[PDB]
């Protein structure tokens, strides 16, 4: 792409500069270029990728929700048209992220932690698509999100301890998917509850800092369980 002529190390350096400058679209473009070099990402680099695109898509999601609310209250074509413009831009960013994951971050991930990280991300970005999709396309997207999240779950249960923060965050987001997207509150509650209990059993084995990390995400599961139960 446009970054094809820039050294990988220069792209990473500029992604970090863009972050300092709060230029998140630039940050995402630099990280996309780095991914497209075809080498695995380190933990630091995959966090840069995730932060950059989360900031971009988060701004689009927030704008889409503002416009959707105005559109709902209005019920001329202009509100719908502009909501559709933002929606199409959001879909484009999600398709870009999903393309990086499928070509070829997931299959090249060299350890369980990174494979779970990327499969969770795949579920997340299909979930963002599902928030704005309709009809048969929405049903296909929902199934794709579920399949990615489930594969991540299978790996995390085999390869990572129940208090591991990446495993906990996956379970959090998959449970949100069940409740908010898939209209499966029973599955959302069951997943959040099982995750919560299996983590609690091991809290006593953790360092102070790990205990803090794990209980923080447990509390996010709890907040959702309280809303749901």
């Amino acid at each position: 792409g446009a970054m094809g002529s820039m050294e990988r190390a220069s792209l990473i350096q500029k992604a970090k500069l863009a972050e300092q400058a709060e230029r998140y679209e630039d940050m995402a473009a630099f990280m996309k270029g780095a991914v497209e070099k075809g080498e695995e990402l380190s933990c630091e680099e995959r966090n840069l990728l995730s932060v950059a695109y989360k900031n971009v898509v988060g701004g689009q999601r927030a704008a889409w929700r503002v416009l959707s609310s105005i559109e709902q209250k209005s019920n001329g074509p202009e509100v719908r048209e502009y909501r559709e413009k933002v929606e199409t831009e959001l879909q484009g960013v999600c398709d870009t992220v999903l393309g990086l994951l499928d070509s070829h971050l997931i299959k090249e991930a060299g350890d369980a932690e990174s494979r779970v990280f990327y499969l969770k991300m795949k579920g997340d970005y299909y979930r963002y698509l599902a928030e704005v999709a309709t009809g048969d396309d929405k049903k296909r997207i929902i199934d794709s999100a579920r399949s990615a999240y489930q594969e991540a779950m299978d790996i995390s249960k085999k390869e990572m301890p129940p208090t591991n923060p990446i495993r906990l965050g996956l379970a959090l987001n998959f449970s949100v998917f069940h409740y908010e997207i898939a209209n499966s509150p029973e599955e959302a509650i069951s997943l959040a509850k099982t995750t919560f209990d299996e983590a609690m059993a091991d809290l006593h084995t953790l360092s102070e800092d790990s205990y803090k990390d794990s209980t923080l995400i447990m509390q996010l599961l709890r907040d959702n369980l309280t809303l749901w139960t």
Binding site: S50, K54, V176, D223, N224
Partner: peptide
């Protein structure tokens, strides 16, 4: 419902 904040 809120998802992971990062």
């Amino acid at each position: 419902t809120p998802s992971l904040p990062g």
